Design a protein around this ligand. Structure first.
Ligand SMILES: *SCCNC(=O)CCNC(=O)[C@H](O)C(C)(C)COP(=O)(O)OP(=O)(O)OC[C@H]1O[C@@H](n2cnc3c(N)ncnc32)[C@H](O)[C@@H]1OP(=O)(O)O
Lengths: 188, 4
């Protein structure tokens, strides 16, 4: 993944952030395969960045799940003149049982952050925050209501810096939740 | 979790 593709990303994705589900519908010469290629390359790049041995995001996995992907294109002009992709965030609701600090196992179904990646060359340029904000607004969720699949320390620092989130009770299911997640807790 |  270099951000650029051998087709016109701006023609494919007219909007700054494009939201796709399992159907991978092109916005309105196989435009759907253009989208699938972008997702495949994004997933491979994200896995590499997270020290994972294989991708957790791909076109095929989008098609066989009920996840939603938000894709941020580059709003600047590139020298190659066909646009570019900055990164993405993938979310999905999941059933979990989470332990609180009162020894209760709570059955929940939160929106989960499942994959999140911004191209290395343009990390720490604010793109991740922009993408995350757009997702919060469309999904109608507040940050402390999220669970995150095995977050990187980079993401925990991002969430603490931008939203003051602090992790709460550690779990055995590989998801992380934050203070405010439980009904008896308060967001920061 | 898929990150396992
Ligand atoms: S759970 C998987 C999350 N993905 C990854 O870990 C993959 C590699 N990182 C990324 O794709 C992006 O760096 C993520 C984590 C998605 C954040 O996006 P941005 O880099 O675009 O974030 P912003 O510029 O909006 O915010 C910057 C703040 O984010 C935290 N942070 C970014 N990068 C790091 C690193 N390398 N180490 C520690 N923290 C990092 C910081 O709080 C950073 O604030 P700064 O002002 O740059 O300090």
């Amino acid at each position: 993944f270099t951000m650029e593709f051998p087709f016109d990303v701006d023609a494919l994705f007219p909007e700054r952030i494009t939201v796709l589900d399992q159907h991978l519908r092109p916005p309105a010469v196989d435009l759907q395969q253009q989208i699938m290629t972008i997702i495949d390359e994004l997933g491979k790049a994200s896995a590499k960045a997270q020290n994972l041995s294989a991708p957790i995001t791909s076109a095929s996995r989008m098609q066989s799940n009920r996840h939603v992907v938000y894709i941020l294109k580059d709003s600047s002009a590139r020298p190659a003149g066909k646009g570019a992709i900055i990164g993405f965030i993938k979310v999905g609701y999941k059933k979990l049982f989470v332990l609180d600090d009162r020894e209760a196992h709570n059955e929940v179904e939160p929106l989960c952050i499942l994959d999140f990646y911004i191209h290395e060359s343009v990390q720490r340029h604010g793109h991740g925050r922009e993408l995350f904000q757009y997702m919060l607004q469309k999904e109608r969720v507040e940050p402390h209501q999220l669970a995150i699949d095995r977050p990187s320390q980079k993401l925990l620092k991002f969430l603490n810096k931008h939203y003051n989130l602090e992790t709460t009770v550690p779990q055995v299911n590989n998801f992380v939740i934050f203070e405010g997640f439980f009904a008896h807790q308060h967001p920061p | 979790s898929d990150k396992t």
